[PDB]
């Protein structure tokens, strides 16, 4: 029987959320953040005219030199306000809902049809060095945590959404996924977001290939239900 669901603005009210959580209508409480917290040149697109914008033309589309290198434009973009290549900065997230799944805990699902290569959410959290990361793997193992929230960012940068993050921390694993991670440069700094890899029909769960290093721990069985399921989680 289909579990409860909630919208992303429900996580904005901490008092109502802690109450919903007590009744199992929302996931367990966490610190909601909109940007990563660290524990320790313009493109050549020709500006669109007032007529071109009114006509529906795309500013900094697929041929944008910044977009092509997975770099977001700044406020100085030649297209200014029109620039469609500032999705992370403008929080131009896909319309998704947080749902209770049968056996994987909470998950994410499309609340509208999502075209292929659509920006879903940024994966936010506490950014750790390799030392802090290993310390937290051991602490989470000791505390018998069930769910994993680490995401590789770059050398000596691992995002941990265990304690602080956003609703991207709820994306589940699938052996036949419909999303992927992409690393994007924003103001000379690397960020990671989820993107659909195919058309995602409304009401479908959003999934990705959760590539995590299993550090000699007992294998977690995978409940993705895919015909080609690998049976276990982790890379
Ligand atoms: C990139 C961040 C991912 N964070 C967790 C998702 C949210 C979680 N469901 C929650 O409610 O907080 C990942 C955890 O969800 C579980 N999960 C994910 N996919 C599967 C699967 N296919 N089979 C069985 N278990 C799975 C598993 O415990 C995994 O460690
Ligand atoms: Zn451009
Ligand atoms: Zn631009
Ligand atoms: Zn699977």
UniProtKB/Swiss-Prot annotation:
Changing residue 10 to N: In ALL; uncertain significance; somatic mutation. May be automethylated. It comes from the Eukaryota. Zn(2+) 3 binds at residues 175, 222, 224, 229. Zn(2+) 1 binds at residues 43, 45, 60, 64. S-adenosyl-L-methionine binds at residues 104-106, 147-149, 172-173, 220, 223. Residues 41-92 form the AWS domain. Changing residue 213 to A: Loss of methyltransferase activity. It is found in: Nucleus; Chromosome. Residues 218-234 form the Post-SET domain. Changing residue 169 to H/G: Loss of methyltransferase activity. Abolishes ability to monomethylate STAT1. Residues 1-235 are annotated as: Interaction with TUBA1A. Residues 94-211 form the SET domain. Zn(2+) 2 binds at residues 60, 73, 77, 83. Ubiquitously expressed. Changing residue 215 to A: Strongly reduced methyltransferase activity. It is linked to Renal cell carcinoma: Renal cell carcinoma is a heterogeneous group of sporadic or hereditary carcinoma derived from cells of the proximal renal tubular epithelium. It is subclassified into clear cell renal carcinoma (non-papillary carcinoma), papillary renal cell carcinoma, chromophobe renal cell carcinoma, collecting duct carcinoma with medullary carcinoma of the kidney, and unclassified renal cell carcinoma. Clear cell renal cell carcinoma is the most common subtype. Luscan-Lumish syndrome: An autosomal dominant syndrome with a variable phenotype. Clinical features include macrocephaly, distinctive facial appearance, postnatal overgrowth, various degrees of learning difficulties, autism spectrum disorder, and intellectual disability. Belongs to the class V-like SAM-binding methyltransferase superfamily. Histone-lysine methyltransferase family. SET2 subfamily. Specifically interacts with hyperphosphorylated C-terminal domain (CTD) of RNA polymerase II large subunit (POLR2A): binds to CTD heptad repeats doubly phosphorylated on 'Ser-2' and 'Ser-5' of each heptad. Interacts with HTT. Interacts with IWS1. Interacts with p53/TP53; leading to regulate p53/TP53 target genes. Component of a complex with HNRNPL. Interacts with TUBA1A; the interaction is independent on alpha-tubulin acetylation on 'Lys-40'. Interacts with STAT1. Histone methyltransferase that specifically trimethylates 'Lys-36' of histone H3 (H3K36me3) using dimethylated 'Lys-36' (H3K36me2) as substrate. It is capable of trimethylating unmethylated H3K36 (H3K36me0) in vitro. Represents the main enzyme generating H3K36me3, a specific tag for epigenetic transcriptional activation. Plays a role in chromatin structure modulation during elongation by coordinating recruitment of the FACT complex and by interacting with hyperphosphorylated POLR2A. The low charge region mediates the transcriptional activation activity. This is Histone-lysine N-methyltransferase SETD2. The gene is SETD2.
